[PDB]
From Swiss-Prot, chains A, D:
InterPro entries: Beta-grasp_dom_sf (IPR012675), MOCS2A (IPR044672), Mopterin_synth/thiamin_S_b (IPR016155), ThiS/MoaD-like (IPR003749). Keywords: Isopeptide bond, Molybdenum cofactor biosynthesis, Nucleotide-binding, Phosphoprotein. It comes from Escherichia coli (strain K12). This is Molybdopterin synthase sulfur carrier subunit. One of its GO terms (cellular component) is molybdopterin adenylyltransferase complex. GO terms for molecular function: nucleotide binding. The modification 1-thioglycine is found at residue 81. The modification Glycyl adenylate is found at residue 81. There is a cross-link at residue 81 (Glycyl lysine isopeptide (Gly-Lys) (interchain with K-119 in MoaE)). GO terms for biological process: Mo-molybdopterin cofactor biosynthetic process. Heterotetramer of 2 MoaD subunits and 2 MoaE subunits. Forms a stable heterotetrameric complex of 2 MoaD and 2 MoeB during adenylation of MoaD by MoeB. During catalysis MoaD shuttles between the two heterotetrameric complexes. Belongs to the MoaD family.
From Swiss-Prot, chains B, C:
Substrate binds at residues 36-38, 95-96, 111, 118-120. There is a cross-link at residue 111 (Glycyl lysine isopeptide (Lys-Gly) (interchain with G-Cter in MoaD)). Induction: By anaerobiosis, repressed by the molybdenum cofactor. The gene is moaE. Pfam families: MoaE (PF02391). This is Molybdopterin synthase catalytic subunit. It comes from Escherichia coli (strain K12).
Length: 81, 142, 142, 81
């Protein structure tokens, strides 16, 4: 699969902490577009320009390619420190 | 050139972290930073598989930019209150200029790249703390 | 807005200085700097009637430039050896940017304005440590 | 009087730690020129461009005026911290 995690506002709005998707997407951006088209809440959760992405616990651009077995996470701008 | 990175609810004490940070003679310049919670409780939500790791990637980058001795980074999670220490950053180097700079760099990247989200327990309910445009401008200057 | 300034042979311990520095809640950003001796003994000669006072004038200036909480400055005198802590600078503020900057400022002005002179006990005899052009360029950028 | 202190290299070369002079000098610079003309060692001690001055424990420019009862100190660039 591809495994997808969500955090903060995004996790609240998509309404699940994690989900799996068909490893059928060339890039993070492709996966994002796909998941956003699932419903109005997902599109609202996953369409912000400031939305961040990570692949196997590293921050990546949205062009970053996917591979069967990856961990993908979407989340809003961070507020730590 | 050892690095200590810890993410957890436990309080830290700068007096306990410090002697390990400052112990090598060749590291003649020691900069620390401590950041506290800015009356309402705060909770730091985080992404567990990624927080220690992003913090380690940030120090890796700092170490390619500046010649650094021992470095420590501690960030807490959970419920904290104004005046509690949330983050510790400790950096050593032969000269003050690289130690202050790496210190500053480590915080600016931590605040825009490390997966933590603050929420505030107000009288009206939880409230996500807003991310600052000034932290984005701080990060991009590096 | 209290200030602690101490000049003397006594060692200090960052663990003892720190809790006083970091104690006020409104001071949510705490930066420390420690500078050590960079194998030969060093002696710091100084101008006693002026060292605490110049250090206080430097903090006064820092306080007009940045909004600072508690500040501590400790500088030692006498014979020290590589790895001994010579100077402590501790600065607090509401934001990291002014705390790091004041920290940096306080050290750059200390190193070009505070009356201390290092000498080195080499096999060939005492030797005055040379003053650096890079400290002059650091001071003038402020 | 005016009281004058010396430190580091300057104290070594002038060969005393302190001295008093006739409060008869309009400025630090005037006092400096005077003391330098006392001998070759004093002139060597007190002529460097980088020589620093202080009046009543404050760093001052060489134009700074003098007054009966002042404490003046000359010393080289500092090497503390
Ligand atoms: Cl689309
Ligand atoms: Cl906070
Ligand atoms: Cl330094
Ligand atoms: Cl600096
Ligand atoms: Cl030294
Ligand atoms: Cl801050
Ligand atoms: Cl900064
Ligand atoms: Cl003359």
């Amino acid at each position: 699969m591809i495994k997808v995690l969500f955090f903060a506002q995004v996790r609240e709005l998509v309404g699940t902490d994690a989900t799996e998707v068909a490893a059928d997407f060339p890039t993070v951006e492709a996966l994002r577009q796909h998941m956003a088209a699932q419903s109005d809440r997902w599109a609202l959760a996953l369409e912000d320009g400031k939305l961040l992405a990570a692949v196997n616990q590293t921050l990546v651009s949205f062009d970053h390619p996917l591979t069967d077995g990856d961990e993908v996470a979407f989340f809003p701008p961070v507020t730590g420190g | 050139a050892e690095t200590k990175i810890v993410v957890g609810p436990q309080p830290f004490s700068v007096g306990e972290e410090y002697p390990w940070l400052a112990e090598r003679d060749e590291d003649g310049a020691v900069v620390t930073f401590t950041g506290k919670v800015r009356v309402n409780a705060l909770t730091l939500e985080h992404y567990p598989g990624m927080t220690e790791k992003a913090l380690a990637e940030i120090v890796d980058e700092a170490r390619n930019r500046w010649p650094l001795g021992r470095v420590t980074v501690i960030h807490r999670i959970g419920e904290l209150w104004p005046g509690d220490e949330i983050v510790f950053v400790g950096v050593t180097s032969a000269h003050r200029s690289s130690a202050f700079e790496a210190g500053q760099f480590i915080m600016d990247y931590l605040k825009t790249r490390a997966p933590f989200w603050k929420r505030e327990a107000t009288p009206e309910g939880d409230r996500w703390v807003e991310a600052r445009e000034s932290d984005q401008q701080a990060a991009k200057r590096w």
